[PDB]
Structures are given as C-alpha cells and as structure tokens.
Amino acid sequence: MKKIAIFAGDGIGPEIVAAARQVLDAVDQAAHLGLRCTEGLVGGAALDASDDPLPAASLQLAMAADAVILGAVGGPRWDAYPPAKRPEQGLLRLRKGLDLYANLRPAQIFPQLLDASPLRPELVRDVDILVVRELTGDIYFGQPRGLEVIDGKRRGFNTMVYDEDEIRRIAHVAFRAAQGRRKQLCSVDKANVLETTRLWREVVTEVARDYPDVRLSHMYVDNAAMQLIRAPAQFDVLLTGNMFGDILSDEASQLTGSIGMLPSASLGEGRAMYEPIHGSAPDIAGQDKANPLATILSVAMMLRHSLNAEPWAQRVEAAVQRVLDQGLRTADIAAPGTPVIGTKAMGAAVVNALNLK
Amino acid sequence: MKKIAIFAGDGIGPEIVAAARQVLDAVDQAAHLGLRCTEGLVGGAALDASDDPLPAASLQLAMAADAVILGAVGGPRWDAYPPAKRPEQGLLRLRKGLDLYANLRPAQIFPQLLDASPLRPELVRDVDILVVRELTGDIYFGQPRGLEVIDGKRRGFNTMVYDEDEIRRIAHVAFRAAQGRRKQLCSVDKANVLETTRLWREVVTEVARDYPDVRLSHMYVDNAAMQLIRAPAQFDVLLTGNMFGDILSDEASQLTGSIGMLPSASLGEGRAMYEPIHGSAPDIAGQDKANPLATILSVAMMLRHSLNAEPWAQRVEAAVQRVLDQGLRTADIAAPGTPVIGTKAMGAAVVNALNLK
Numbered sequence: 227m228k229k230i231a232i233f234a235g236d237g238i239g240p241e242i243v244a245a246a247r248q249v250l251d252a253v254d255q256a257a258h259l260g261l262r263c264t265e266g267l268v269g270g271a272a273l274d275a276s277d278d279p280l281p282a283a284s285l286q287l288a289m290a291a292d293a294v295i296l297g298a299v300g301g302p303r304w305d306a307y308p309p310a311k312r313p314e315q316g317l318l319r320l321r322k323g324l325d326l327y328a329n330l331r332p333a334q335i336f337p338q339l340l341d342a343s344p345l346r347p348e349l350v351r352d353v354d355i356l357v358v359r360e361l362t363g364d365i366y367f368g369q370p371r372g373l374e375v376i377d378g379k380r381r382g383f384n385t386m387v388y389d390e391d392e393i394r395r396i397a398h399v400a401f402r403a404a405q406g407r408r409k410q411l412c413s414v415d416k417a418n419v420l421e422t423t424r425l426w427r428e429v430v431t432e433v434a435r436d437y438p439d440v441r442l443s444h445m446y447v448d449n450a451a452m453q454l455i456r457a458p459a460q461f462d463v464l465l466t467g468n469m470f471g472d473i474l475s476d477e478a479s480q481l482t483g484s485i486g487m488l489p490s491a492s493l494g495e496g497r498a499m500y501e502p503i504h505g506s507a508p509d510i511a512g513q514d515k516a517n518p519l520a521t522i523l524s525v526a527m528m529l530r531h532s533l534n535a536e537p538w539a540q541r542v543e544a545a546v547q548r549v550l551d552q553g554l555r556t557a558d559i560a561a562p563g564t565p566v567i568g569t570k571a572m573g574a575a576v577v578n579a580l581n582l583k
Numbered sequence: 584m585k586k587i588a589i590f591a592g593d594g595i596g597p598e599i600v601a602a603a604r605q606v607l608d609a610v611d612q613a614a615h616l617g618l619r620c621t622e623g624l625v626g627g628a629a630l631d632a633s634d635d636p637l638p639a640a641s642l643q644l645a646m647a648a649d650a651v652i653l654g655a656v657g658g659p660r661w662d663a664y665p666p667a668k669r670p671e672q673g674l675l676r677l678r679k680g681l682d683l684y685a686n687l688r689p690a691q692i693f694p695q696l697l698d699a700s701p702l703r704p705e706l707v708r709d710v711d712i713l714v715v716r717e718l719t720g721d722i723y724f725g726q727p728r729g730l731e732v733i734d735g736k737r738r739g740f741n742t743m744v745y746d747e748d749e750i751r752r753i754a755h756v757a758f759r760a761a762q763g764r765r766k767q768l769c770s771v772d773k774a775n776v777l778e779t780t781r782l783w784r785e786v787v788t789e790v791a792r793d794y795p796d797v798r799l800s801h802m803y804v805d806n807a808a809m810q811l812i813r814a815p816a817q818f819d820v821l822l823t824g825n826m827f828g829d830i831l832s833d834e835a836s837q838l839t840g841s842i843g844m845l846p847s848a849s850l851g852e853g854r855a856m857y858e859p860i861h862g863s864a865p866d867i868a869g870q871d872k873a874n875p876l877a878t879i880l881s882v883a884m885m886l887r888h889s890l891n892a893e894p895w896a897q898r899v900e901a902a903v904q905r906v907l908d909q910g911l912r913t914a915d916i917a918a919p920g921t922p923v924i925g926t927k928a929m930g931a932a933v934v935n936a937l938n939l940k
C-alpha cells in the first residue's frame with residue numbers, strides 16, 4: 227500500500243488537482259494499486275487556516291507519504307504577510323524537508339500545439355530536453371544570509387554553496403537520465419567567475435568516468451541562455467544548480483509554448499513530489515478554466531518514478547495525446563474562435579481517453 | 584584633450600579594434616576631437632607578455648584614460664593557467680578597478696538583419712530593449728568566496744551581496760535611461776527567495792519616487808527568461824544585477840539574431856569602457872572574417888557617453904545602417920550565396936559611408 231499526500235494549494239491549484247485526481251482514481255481502480263491518499267494544507271490555504279505556509283501537521287503528512295502531489299502555491303492575497311511566512315516558503319520547506327534534491331522538468335512540444343511556440347517552427351520542431359535541476363542546496367538554502375544595517379546602510383547577502391556530495395548525487399541522476407535518453411549531458415555553470423560552480427564542473431567531470439556511454443559537455447549559464455533559443459535541438463539532458471536551473475527551466479518551458487502542459491518531478495531518497503511548473507494563476511481561480519494536463523502528466527511521472535507502474539504512466543501519457551488528437555483544448559491551448567472545454571471536462575476527457583474496459 | 588586606453592585583447596579583438604579604429608580616426612580628424620590613444624595588454628595577450636591578465640601598467644593606463652576600448656578576452660590557449668590568472672580576470676579587474684558599475688547593453692535588431700532572429704518574425708520585429716546591469720557588485724565580487732575541504736569533503740562557496748548605495752546608483756542610471764526612452768522600467772530580482780534581491784526591489788521602489796514619469800514594475804528572474812521570448816516588445820529598459828544581468832542580456836542578444844552587431848558601455852564616475860559582447864571567437868581569429876560592427880557601434884556609444892560627440896555618435900550609427908542598406912555583409916550576417924566582405928573592408932566601408940571630405 228502506497229500513501230499519497232495531497233497539497234492542492236492556492237488559486238487554480240485545487241481545481242487542477244481535482245481534475246488530475248479523477249485520472250489518478252481511475253488508474254488506481256483499473257490497476258488495483260491500493261493507494262491511500264490524504265489531503266493537507268500548504269501555501270496560502272495553510273496561512274488562511276493556520277497562519278503558516280507549511281504547518282507541522284502538513285509536514286509530517288508529507289514525510290509519512292511515499293509520493294506527494296502539489297497543485298500550486300502563491301497569490302497577492304498573502305503579500306501582507308512577513309517574508310518568512312509567504313506561500314512559496316511552504317514549497318521550499320517541503321522540498322528541503324523531504325530532501326527532494328532531483329528536480330526533473332522535461333521540455334517537449336505536443337505536435338498539435340507546435341504553433342504556440344515563440345520560436346520559428348523549424349527550430350522547435352523536435353525540442354526534447356530534460357532539465358535536471360539541483361533542488362535542495364545552492365544559494366537558495368545557503369547560510370549565512372539575510373538583511374543587515376552596517377554603519378547606517380542596509381546590506382543584503384546570500385551564500386552560494388555546494389559540497390562534493392550534493393553535486394555528485396544530482397550528477398548521477400542526470401547521467402542515468404542521459405543514458406536512458408540520447409546519451410548527451412550538458413552541465414551548466416559559471417566556472418570562470420563563481421568558484422562554487424567551478425567545483426560543480428570538477429565533480430561532474432569526475433562522475434563522468436562512471437558513464438563512458440554518455441557525451442558530457444560544459445557550458446556557461448549565459449551562453450546556455452542563448453543556445454536554448456538559437457538551437458534548442460542540441461540539448462538532451464541539461465544539468466545545473468538550483469538557481470541556474472530555475473532560470474533556464476523557465477526558458478526551456480516558454481520555448482515549448484504551452485506552460486499548462488508541462489509536468490515535473492522532485493526526487494529524493496524514497497520520496498518524491500510532483501507538481502506542475504505553471505504557477506497558481508490567481509486571475510482564473512475557480513473559473514474551471516485552468517489546464518490540468520500538466521498536473522495530470524505529473525501524475526504519470528509519479529506512476530513511473532514512485533509507484534512502479536510504468537505501463538500505467540504510459541497509458542496516462544497516451545490518453546493526454548488522445549485528448550489532443552480528438553481536438554480537445556482548454557483556454558490556454560485553444561486558437562481564437564476554436565471550441566474550448568473546462569478543467570473538469572478535460573479531466574473526465576482524459577479518463578475516457580484512457581479507454582478503460 | 585581626451586585620453587583613450589585601447590586594449591585589443593585576444594582572438595578577433597586585434598582585428599575588430601583596428602576596423603573600429605579606422606572609424607574613430609576618421610571621426611577624430613573630421614570632428615577635430617584631439618584624442619590621445621594608447622595601447623595596452625589585457626587577457627591572454629597580457630599573459631603571454633607578462634604572465635598576468637591585467638598588469639599594473641595596463642591598470643594605470645586605463646585609470647588615467649577618459650574612455651577605454653576593449654576588443655575581446657579569452658581562449659583555450661590559457662586553460663593551463665591557474666583560475667586567478669585566466670584572461671577573464673583581466674576584464675573583471677578592469678570593471679572593478681575603474682568602478683564601472685553601469686553596464687548598458689541595447690538589444691535592437693537591424694531591419695535588414697531580421698532573418699537571423701530565432702523568434703517568430705511578428706514578435707521580434709519591434710524589439711527595442713536596453714539592459715542596464717549592475718557590474719561591480721553582487722556575487723561576482725562578494726566575499727568570502729573560495730574552495731575548501733571540511734571533514735574530508737570539498738566545499739565551494741561565493742557570497743552574493745548588495746548594499747543600498749550600490750543599488751541606488753545603478754537604479755538612477757536605469758531610471759534616467761528609461762526617461763529618454765519609453766519611460767518603462769522592469770526591475771528583475773528573486774525577492775521571494777533571495778534576500779539580497781528583496782533589498783534590491785525595495786531600494787529600486789524607493790528611487791522610483793524620483794521618477795514619476797517612468798512606470799516601474801517588478802518581475803522574478805525566471806519569469807523574465809520566459810517573458811523575453813514570449814513577448815520581447817513588452818520590455819523597454821530592464822534593470823537587474825550582475826549575475827542575472829549576465830544571463831538575461833545574453834538571452835536578449837540571441838533573439839536579435841546577430842551577436843556581431845551588439846555594442847556595450849560600462850560606465851562609472853568619470854570613466855567608461857566600451858566592448859562588443861560576442862567574445863573572442865578564437866576559431867576565426869586572424870582570418871579577417873570577424874564582424875567589426877559591434878565594436879564600431881561601441882565606439883559610437885563612446886562618442887555619446889564619453890567624448891560628448893552625440894552628432895558624431897549618430898553619424899557613425901547612420902553609417903553602419905548605410906553599409907547594411909548597400910548590402911555589405913561579413914560572414915556572420917551574410918545569407919548563404921550572398922556576397923561576403925572581410926573585417927578590414929567592412930571597417931573601410933563604414934568610414935566611406937560616413938560621407939566625409
């Protein structure tokens with residue numbers, strides 16, 4: 227029996243999770259996984275009920291689970307709150323608390339959604355990239371950090387740090403991912419300015435000896451920002467830190483064109499959290515407009531990386547393709563004047579497209 | 584009388600500065616500017632001569648000058664050199680030595696060079712962005728930093744840091760730049776995760792009160808990486824830090840399509856350095872192939888920002904446009920099967936296109 231902790235969150239979080247839960251419950255019944263799901267509050271929903279973005283109870287729930295599903299966190303409703311109590315702090319505490327250091331963000335375009343891409347057609351025709359971003363270390367969690375007043379002058383500071391063990395584990399994930407893809411890994415750094423990232427380059431080069439079958443390349447983060455646009459098809463697996471991964475992942479996501487179709491996995495030792503990478507989009511919250519396909523595709527990642535159900539992870543991914551083939555579109559992926567369906571209907575549509583006996 | 588310190592550097596640097604020199608000399612003579620130019624060593628050229636990327640002599644020449652011109656620094660030739668002596672250290676030490684805190688990198692696309700752009704023509708057609716990047720602070724120059732061993736494990740660290748004065752001065756340049764443009768300023772940070780960048784947002788918000796004519800908006804760095812390609816025309820002046828500015832400016836450069844056309848200005852109090860932003864292109868170094876136009880346009884920025892020769896800055900800029908209308912193209916900006924001219928010829932073409940006598 228597998229325990230799944232659910233943290234819908236803020237904005238469109240609740241509705242996109244409900245839609246994806248339809249699909250999840252469907253696969254569970256068909257496959258007989260015997261999953262037990264529990265719901266906990268996170269982000270702004272948690273602040274509203276407990277004045278804390280990740281209550282202790284919510285944290286223990288996640289710790290006690292095998293897989294974690296999160297909808298979204300964030301919204302201007304909580305700006306009046308202190309920085310340490312902001313909605314995304316709960317997300318950061320989940321990642322850090324569960325030590326989910328391997329963030330996997332696959333970037334590819336659905337053939338029926340190619341026109342949504344900002345780049346010229348011929349460039350992004352075959353963009354299939356996997357950003358493997360380190361999630362629990364770096365400047366994000368480095369100490370010391372903070373704001374201070376030195377001689378009447380405000381000074382802000384943050385510490386970027388990584389030790390050889392943190393770099394080695396994320397590298398193994400990226401190298402193993404490359405082997406199961408096109409055998410190409412690009413480690414991104416700023417080794418000629420930032421010493422932390424030079425150690426990053428050195429340790430990845432050492433681990434590269436363990437994967438003679440993969441072609442390793444190093445690239446500076448600024449140059450990588452140009453290459454993603456200039457020739458995206460050159461990338462297979464892109465490895466980088468927390469900070470650089472945050473930026474380059476969003477860049478990779480935009481060039482696919484449809485952010486509401488992009489899933490993600492955050493893996494650690496014996497745990498994992500799955501969430502869409504599109505945010506809480508507050509302005510459409512509760513309007514049944516949100517695209518749940520990214521959350522649904524994240525469930526497919528969970529079936530694969532956490533529930534030992536590859537055949538079913540594929541069937542979920544196939545149903546999503548099927549829904550698109552049959553012309554079903556949510557507002558974000560539909561052309562002007564073209565028919566559009568809501569969050570609820572899109573969920574029930576994938577369940578049907580599952581062609582369950 | 585004004586002094587100009589010239590540092591050609593490595594790779595294509597010597598040839599692109601010579602072409603640019605043809606233009607500077609043509610303008611100096613015609614305008615009667617009375618400029619005193621001196622040449623120094625920087626980067627690998629300085630290493631080969633002094634085993635130091637920025638010898639004390641080079642620093643004093645630059646410190647004595649009114650304006651500095653730099654071609655390019657870097658190359659695999661100096662990989663055998665210790666991290667502290669790599670060619671790029673000379674560049675950083677110049678920016679820091681002369682306290683050139685305001686980096687200006689205008690991202691515009693030339694009408695006849697629109698086909699080089701990677702974005703869908705309708706998006707890029709009207710791109711007119713100016714990236715104002717803080718150049719002397721941030722994690723780039725933050726202390727402490729280094730590589731150590733704790734309990735037998737390697738640890739890499741760097742310090743990101745900014746005080747209110749550092750932010751106030753770069754904010755002023757950006758707000759002022761925006762006034763003379765579309766009066767729209769976008770400040771990029773990661774205020775929800777990094778405290779240094781939250782102070783950045785706060786101080787910028789403070790200085791914004793001095794510029795009621797310019798509209799200020801804040802955006803997270805990851806979102807900016809998306810917004811640049813999704814809808815580049817939304818940006819006028821984009822203000823951000825050293826590291827973020829490093830990544831975002833390169834992304835903005837790529838969407839214009841032709842990196843060989845982009846100029847830059849690093850301004851400080853009474854000092855200024857001008858360099859292109861394409862790198863040393865070691866592979867074509869010394870083949871008279873390099874596009875000298877970015878450097879020429881950098882000289883144009885110098886006429887405007889240092890030599891107080893705005894009308895002559897415009898004429899150089901007008902001459903570069905004329906050359907393109909004439910259909911003159913170096914390899915990098917030439918369509919396949921189109922006539923291609925060398926570095927030297929392209930420089931002469933601009934001087935001729937100045938229509939002097």
Ligand SMILES: CC(C)[C@H](C(=O)O)[C@@H](O)C(=O)O
Nearest residue numbers: 314315317318472775776805
């Ligand atoms: C919301 C924020 C704290 C988070 C991050 O910076 O990692 C987000 O931008 C992401 O990439 O998932």
Ligand SMILES: CC(C)[C@H](C(=O)O)[C@@H](O)C(=O)O
Nearest residue numbers: 418419448671674675829860
């Ligand atoms: C070479 C490097 C130190 C420098 C920087 O990172 O600022 C360069 O990439 C640039 O953009 O001028």
Ligand SMILES: [Mg+2]
Nearest residue numbers: 472473476805
């Ligand atoms: Mg992000």
Ligand SMILES: [Mg+2]
Nearest residue numbers: 448829830833
């Ligand atoms: Mg750069």
